[PDB]
Amino acid sequence: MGIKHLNLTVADVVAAREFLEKYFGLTCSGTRGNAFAVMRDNDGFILTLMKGKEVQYPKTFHVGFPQESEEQVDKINQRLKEDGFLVEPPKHAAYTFYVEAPGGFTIEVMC
């Protein structure tokens, strides 16, 4: 089954969880207080969030959330910008942009 789990250490589990729910439609299947949250997508990928920052992720590190259309990429970009997150217009290579998620890791959004 290849790669199906990522344990992402973050600065703030609650903030990272709510961001992923709002913008990326992940679902939470469990928590241990504010220390731990288990997030799932539709395909059974498990992305656990774990408190305890000592260090920043390498700057090129990112997690990618593909979208069904360029319109959907634009929509997420727009709403992030409106909601106070620091984003720039997506670029055509895939049609792609990046955002820093609360918690302290970069997300790639693309079609």
Residue 28 binding a copy of itself, by CB under 8 A: yes
- Rounded alpha-carbon distances, angstroms, from residue 32 to 46, 49, 74: 16, 10, 34
Binding to a copy of itself in span 59-98, by CB under 8 A: 75, 79, 82
Where b means 16+ CB within 10 Å and e means fewer, 85-101 reads eebeebeeeebbbbbeb
Residue 40 binding a copy of itself, by CB under 8 A: no
User: What is the nearest approach in angstroms of Mg ion to the Cβ of residue 108?
Assistant: 5
**How long is the chain?**
111
Q: Which of 4, 7, 25, 91 binds a copy of itself (CB under 8 A)?
A: 25
Cβ closest to a copy of itself, residue 31 vs residue 96: 31
Q: Beta strand 105-110 with 62-66: parallel, antiparallel or unpaired?
A: parallel
108 is in an annotated binding site: yes
**Known binding positions for Mg(2+):** 62, 108
User: Which residues in this chain contact a copy of itself in the complex, by CB under 8 A?
Assistant: 18, 21-22, 25, 27-28, 75, 79, 82
